[PDB]
Amino acid sequence: ISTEEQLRRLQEEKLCKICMDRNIAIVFVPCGHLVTCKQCAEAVDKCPMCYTVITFKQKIFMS
Amino acid sequence: EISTEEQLRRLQEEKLCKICMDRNIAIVFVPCGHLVTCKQCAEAVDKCPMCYTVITFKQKIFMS
Ligand SMILES: [Zn+2]
Ligand SMILES: [Zn+2]
Ligand SMILES: [Zn+2]
Ligand SMILES: [Zn+2]
């Protein structure tokens, strides 16, 4: 796996898994999935990865 | 103008726990939202090390 591809993969890991445009911003409580931006998280009542009901949408901060 | 090797090393460093700098970040603090500790180090803090907000709950994260 090339260095350019490893870098591209870590950069993609930071992206919202729905829009792949905005960065991840929300952790779902209680399942813990960290897979959406704030906009893409609005419409979901169940986690689109594991289908656990979302009790709370916690905004994340890296700094 | 940063080399590919250095850009990769920097993104990898960004995933490290800010207390141990060994294990990866795995916990988000509720309510402040800071994502700065691994599971083990989160057990040592009662306040967020970034903003000093009292931590009400330590939520495990999953990227996949
Ligand atoms: Zn999105
Ligand atoms: Zn989930
Ligand atoms: Zn740690
Ligand atoms: Zn904080």
Author numbering:
A (entry chain B): 435 to 497
B (entry chain A): 434 to 497
Give the text the authors published on this PDB structure.
We report the development of three ubiquitin variants (UbVs), each binding selectively to the RING or U-box domain of a distinct E3 ligase: monomeric UBE4B, phosphorylated active CBL, or dimeric XIAP. With ∼600 members, the RING/U-box E3s form the largest family. This family uses a RING or U-box domain to recruit E2 enzymes thioesterified with Ub (E2∼Ub) and facilitates transfer of Ub directly to substrate. RING/U-box domains promote Ub transfer by shifting the equilibrium of E2∼Ub into a closed conformation (Dou et al., 2012b, Plechanovová et al., 2012, Pruneda et al., 2012). We generated selective UbVs for each RING/U-box domain and used biochemical assays and structural studies to identify two types of UbVs: competitive inhibitors of E2∼Ub binding sites on UBE4B or phosphorylated CBL and an activator of XIAP.
We determined the crystal structure of XR bound to UbV.XRD to 1.57 Å but were unable to obtain crystals of an XR-UbV.XRM complex. XR adopts a dimeric RING domain arrangement similar to structures of BIRC3 and BIRC7 in which the C-terminal tail of each subunit interacts with the second subunit (Dou et al., 2012b, Mace et al., 2008). UbV.XRD forms a symmetrical domain-swapped dimer in which β1 is flipped 180° away from the β sheet of its own subunit and is replaced by β1′ from the other subunit. In the complex, the UbV dimer forms a groove that cradles the RING dimer, covering a surface area of 816 Å2 that is remote from the E2∼Ub binding site. The groove is formed by the β2-β1′-β1-β2′ β sheet that comprises the UbV dimer interface. Two symmetrical hydrophobic pockets at the base of the groove bind the two Phe490 residues from the XR dimer. Symmetrical salt bridges between UbV.XRD Glu46 side chains (Ala46 in Ub) and XR Lys472 side chains also appear to stabilize the complex. UbV.XRD did not stimulate UbcH5B S22R∼Ub discharge catalyzed by XR T489E or XR F490R, even though both variants were comparably active to wild-type XR in promoting UbcH5B S22R∼Ub discharge in the presence of Ub74. Given this relatively small surface area, it is noteworthy that UbV.XR activates E3 activity through binding to a region on XIAP that has not previously been reported to be involved in protein-protein interactions. Our data suggest that UbV.XR stimulates XIAP-mediated Ub transfer by binding the RING domain and stabilizing donor Ub in a conformation primed for catalysis.
